[PDB]
From TrEMBL, chains A, B, D, E:
UMP binds at residues 3, 36-37, 51-52. The keyword RNA-binding applies. One of its GO terms (molecular function) is RNA binding. The lineage of its organism: Bacteria, Pseudomonadati, Pseudomonadota, Gammaproteobacteria, Enterobacterales. This is RNA-binding protein Hfq. Belongs to the Hfq family. It comes from Escherichia coli. Homohexamer. Keywords: RNA-binding, Stress response. Residues 4-60 form the Sm domain. GO terms for biological process: regulation of DNA-templated transcription; regulation of RNA stability; regulation of translation, ncRNA-mediated. RNA chaperone that binds small regulatory RNA (sRNAs) and mRNAs to facilitate mRNA translational regulation in response to envelope stress, environmental stress and changes in metabolite concentrations. Also binds with high specificity to tRNAs. The keyword RNA-binding applies. GO terms for cellular component: cytosol.
Length: 60, 60, 62, 60, 60, 61
RNA sequence: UAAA
């Protein structure tokens, strides 16, 4: 798995990320946690993002 | 599983949440219940939403 | 597991409730749920059509 | 399985069908064969349709 | 499997094909090769197309 | 498997500039740094992780 | 950063 180390490194070092959804919309925040299906993305509070709806994840 | 505690917290408290679908549609209501593949969202109606059609679940 | 979906669709089927099925592409289908399995729902209006669940976003009583 | 008897009846009886795709397009033909993943649809030509791209199948 | 025979027939005879994607884009060329998840489509250059994105494969 | 991995591995090893077209039509560009069963790491200014479920086509630029 |  490249995905888990890539996300764990963004999580562990509290890096700001942009998550682009499959419809083009860009979300931003920090990865609080993730599992096989979802990413919890936190600003004030965490929204839950389904991985099946994500196209790309980048630091920024 | 991160989904179950995340959704059960919203369900127990009956707070408003926005469910954004992969096609951009925003649904607004309370999480009435859920299972492995669907969420029941309650406003003036109770509607069953397939998780495969959901991008994000965002507490209001 | 399926403890929500199956009783929700079965109740609609049993009581012949007019339903709306919204597809992910935005189209609204209407009819009665005649039956369903793991992957499809049979929706009856003038005739029965097989709707793939993977194409569906929402199901609600009309 | 409801899917398999539904499609087999159309196939065996040579029923003209409309297959609606997830982008709204309607294809028309007779079902030549199908498996877990695809339906082969015959009109003027033979074409392979992936089930994941189908929303609806109905006799025309 | 209906895919392997269908696609091999096109590959073998060098049939010009249209590969329609679920988003409506029409790709055109000849089938160079394929596996369980992708089709290699050759025209100006050789492009790898994910089957999960394909709606239909049809002669041009 | 037997076609996907050699295709992507050759692009990776020679550091070929590639175009990755997403299902929403957007075109991404960069170098394939690495890949696994579910994602491609795509390198340009930064490294971004691209989910394969969101990709329609991969082609050298 | 979005179609109550």
């Amino acid at each position: 798995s490249l995905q888990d180390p890539f996300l764990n490194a963004l999580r562990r070092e509290r890096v700001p990320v942009s998550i682009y959804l499959v419809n083009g919309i860009k979300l931003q925040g920090q990865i609080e946690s993730f599992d096989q299906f979802v990413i919890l993305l936190k600003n004030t509070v965490s929204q839950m993002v389904y991985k099946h709806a994500i196209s790309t994840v980048v630091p920024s």
